[PDB]
């Protein structure tokens, strides 16, 4: 009955562990010895976008690398024009408890959700010059931690009820429900070709989901606590996960195991955001100390610091052309470094 | 600035003006966090507080040029540790306990543990606690034949339907507070009480007054 199933599960877990240990030839910290270091990158805050009156909980760049949405706890979702700092729209929300925000790849829609369990999708490019809710995707049980557009008609969401979902915006209901996690789901990130996506949970494990089939492919677990952020390598075969034990990690999708670990003895605070660079050589990471860090993704040695915030940084984004880095924080100021 | 960039800047300044007006409109109002326990019966509680001229839900109460917002986190499977830092600027929590649940399995120790957990978060340091103890008449009618002295260990008082059952439980719920800094605005609400709104107004006024004493150097 249950005993046979438990025994088979444990035996096969040992089997897969020994398997992923068999194909482990050498570390990455050795293959990247004959590489010139990048030195020290110092970046200065070129912009400072102000106008929010509370914490800023999310942020996302437009694919033209110029506009960016930002969602705050004062009931506002503002669409800044980062080049000239203007505001383009200031959408008022129905529930002011938001914890996520997204911008469509085409640039037509935006999305936001929070403690109200509902992911609202606002349509920007409409007639009547207004900005009205197109759909209100409901069906989750806990809060929504992240939500990422795929097309103008599909969206993946991840909620605190231990599930992810793939909504078809047109009809309005889940077309696929990704289950298998144990704790909450705090963050999510799509592959550059939008055929897979990784999701980080509070049970110290990240998973790789296949959008087409709808079932888990691989289960990465090397952390010691919850995972607050995740982001893919620009190549598409690696991703970085920020945890609350103050350590980022870089796993490989084909080796099925972890490659590198980024941690210093001075940093002890949790990690709120993770992002790569256009090349993927660097690695921006936000911390609770109110200062960013720029790790060297190939040698693991820290290579700079971006300290310009008074309170914890909660969102961090890199433009699609790599030309800037926006960081938001709980003092209502998000700045644009370069 | 071309002929259109000036209009874009004007639109941005109007957007920012509306942001400022809405922000000053939303600074006047106060926000309270209602955190009831399991089967503590806060449905009838909010029903009563709303009828007598009063996911996540917000109840707005207009009281004498003040606007309270009772924020009830109704349905959440989120273990309370990940979203609670949203409510770090609330004026006061509103813990809602039940008195009659010293027997159900027990149930009361769960309420004590929840209170102790919520009260020690580093987010609630500038916000007072406002206990309510619903279902008092159920305690008065139930405390007979109850032998409360076996369920809770010490209970120095009399084994009868004494007022100890009501004050002993308040002492148990107060002794879980980190002392000398925070004051707990207790209360003994029944199923058919009416002064809940007045007591909440009084406790919020006292909280603001003590915060202004601490902030205005007047101490």
């Amino acid at each position: 009955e249950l005993d046979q199933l438990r025994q088979e599960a444990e035996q096969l877990k040992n089997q897969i562990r020994d398997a992923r240990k068999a194909c482990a030839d050498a570390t990455l910290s050795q293959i990247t010895n004959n590489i010139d270091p990048v030195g020290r990158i110092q970046m200065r805050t070129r912009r400072t976008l102000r106008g929010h009156l509370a914490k800023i909980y999310a942020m996302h760049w437009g694919t033209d690398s110029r506009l960016l949405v930002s969602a705050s706890q004062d009931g506002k979702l503002i669409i800044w024009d980062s080049y000239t700092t203007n505001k383009v729209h200031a959408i008022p929300l129905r529930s002011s408890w938001v914890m996520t925000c997204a911008y469509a790849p085409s640039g037509n829609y935006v999305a936001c959700g929070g403690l109200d369990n509902i992911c609202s999708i606002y349509n920007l490019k409409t007639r009547e010059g207004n900005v009205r809710v197109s759909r209100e995707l409901a069906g989750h049980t806990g809060y929504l931690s992240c939500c990422r557009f795929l097309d103008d008609n599909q969206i993946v969401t991840s909620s605190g009820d231990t599930t992810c979902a793939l909504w078809d915006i047109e009809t309005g209901q889940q077309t696929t429900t990704f289950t298998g996690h144990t704790g909450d789901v705090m963050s999510l990130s799509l592959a550059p070709d939008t055929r897979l996506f990784v999701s980080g949970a509070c049970d110290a494990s990240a998973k790789l989901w296949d959008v087409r089939e709808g079932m888990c492919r691989q289960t990465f677990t090397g952390h010691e606590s919850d995972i607050n952020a995740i982001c893919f390598f620009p190549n598409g075969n690696a991703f970085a996960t920020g945890s609350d034990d103050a350590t980022c990690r870089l796993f490989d999708l084909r080796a099925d195991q972890e490659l590198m670990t980024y941690s210093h003895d001075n940093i002890i605070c949790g990690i709120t955001s993770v992002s790569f660079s256009k090349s993927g050589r660097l690695l921006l990471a936000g911390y609770d100390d109110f200062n960013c860090n720029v790790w060297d993704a190939l040698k693991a040695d820290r290579a700079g610091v971006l300290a310009g915030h008074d309170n914890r940084v909660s969102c961090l984004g890199v433009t699609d052309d790599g030309m800037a880095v926006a960081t938001g924080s709980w003092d209502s100021f998000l700045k644009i470094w370069n | 600035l071309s002929a259109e960039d000036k209009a874009a800047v004007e639109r941005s300044k109007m957007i920012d003006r509306n942001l400022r007006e809405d922000g000053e409109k939303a600074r006047r109002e106060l926000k309270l966090l209602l955190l009831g326990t399991g089967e503590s019966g806060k449905s009838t509680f909010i029903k009563q507080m709303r009828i007598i001229h009063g996911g996540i839900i917000e109840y707005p109460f207009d009281l004498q040029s003040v606007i309270f917002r009772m924020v009830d986190v109704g349905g959440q499977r989120s273990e309370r540790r990940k979203w609670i830092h949203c409510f770090e600027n609330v004026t006061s929590i509103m813990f809602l306990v039940a008195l009659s649940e010293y027997d159900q399995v027990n149930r009361m120790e769960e309420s004590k543990a929840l209170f102790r957990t919520i009260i020690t978060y580093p987010w609630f340091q500038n916000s007072s606690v406002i206990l309510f103890l619903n279902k008092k008449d159920l305690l008065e009618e139930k405390i007979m034949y109850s032998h409360l002295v076996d369920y809770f260990p010490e209970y120095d008082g009399p084994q009868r339907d004494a007022q100890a059952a009501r004050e002993f439980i308040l002492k148990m719920f107060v002794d879980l507070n980190p002392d000398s800094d925070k004051i707990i605005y207790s209360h003994f609400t029944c199923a058919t009480d009416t002064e809940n709104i007045r007591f909440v107004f009084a406790a919020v006024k006292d909280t603001i007054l003590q915060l202004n004493l601490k902030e205005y150097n007047l101490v």
Epitope: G107 | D5, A7, A8, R11
Partner: single-chain antibody, 230 residues
Framework: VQLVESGGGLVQPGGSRKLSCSAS????????MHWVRQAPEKGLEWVAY????????YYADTVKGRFTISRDDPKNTLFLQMTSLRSEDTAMYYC??????????????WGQGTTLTVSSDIVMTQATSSVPVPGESVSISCRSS???????????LYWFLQRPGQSPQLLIY???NLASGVPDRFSGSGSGTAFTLTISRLEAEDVGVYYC?????????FGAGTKLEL
């Protein structure tokens, strides 16, 4: 969305009048409105401009002082008070909406107009006056006086199409982008001070007049026009 204008009629020279445009279907409070008049057998001419919130007002140099524009947001109306009308104002006054932000398309929806009867500038020249034309590709050209390309890369030149007995509509804004609801057979291109519009596979209800407007300095000069006849 819809705009309905009212006023006009026979007016004695030197009198006064008020034109009222009622807007129904859109957020009038967020749109800057224009007035674009049109003589009987001539082309379009800018008249006045009122911003959103009435915080910015402009007029044309030939109607400066004796016209007064205003807007009423609660009632959703736009008023143009005209005083001492000369005998050269017998024109049909269209009302134009326009919203300016990064990525917007001003002048998108022009309402209908009212026909009165009163009993420097970037000179733009559409040299083509009449081009004969179905199913074949046609091209129209517009020449600007000074360079319309601004330092930020945007080139402000718009193309409008007016059919016989209708109101002109936005085809292309900023010389590259196509407006919404426009068939994909239209295209626009060119370089600084020389712009072109190319049409492929002409259909019915496509003959009309093409106007090239600039939006750089706010006298907002228009073009002469190019009628496509059969």
């Amino acid at each position: 969305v819809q705009l309905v204008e009212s006023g006009g009629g026979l007016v004695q020279p030197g009198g006064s009048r008020k034109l009222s445009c009622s807007a129904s279907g859109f957020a009038f409070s967020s749109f800057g409105m224009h007035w674009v008049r049109q003589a009987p057998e001539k082309g379009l001419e800018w008249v006045a401009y009122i911003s959103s919130g009435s915080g910015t007002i402009y007029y044309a140099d030939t109607v400066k002082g004796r016209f007064t524009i205003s807007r009423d947001d609660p009632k959703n109306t736009l008023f143009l008070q005209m005083t001492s009308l000369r005998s050269e104002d017998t024109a049909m006054y269209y009302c134009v909406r326009s919203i300016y932000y990064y990525g917007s398309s001003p002048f998108d929806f022009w309402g209908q107009g009212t026909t009165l009867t009163v009993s420097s500038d970037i000179v733009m020249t559409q040299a083509t006056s009449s081009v004969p034309v179905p199913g074949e590709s046609v091209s129209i050209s517009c020449r600007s006086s000074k360079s319309l390309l601004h330092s930020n890369g945007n080139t402000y030149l718009y193309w409008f199409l007016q059919r016989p007995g209708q109101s002109p509509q936005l085809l292309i804004y900023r010389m590259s982008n196509l407006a919404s609801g426009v068939p994909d057979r239209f295209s626009g291109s060119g370089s600084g001070t020389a712009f072109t519009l190319t049409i492929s596979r002409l259909e019915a209800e496509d003959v009309g007049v093409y106007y090239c407007m600039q939006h750089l300095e706010y006298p907002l000069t228009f073009g002469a026009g190019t009628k496509l006849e059969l």
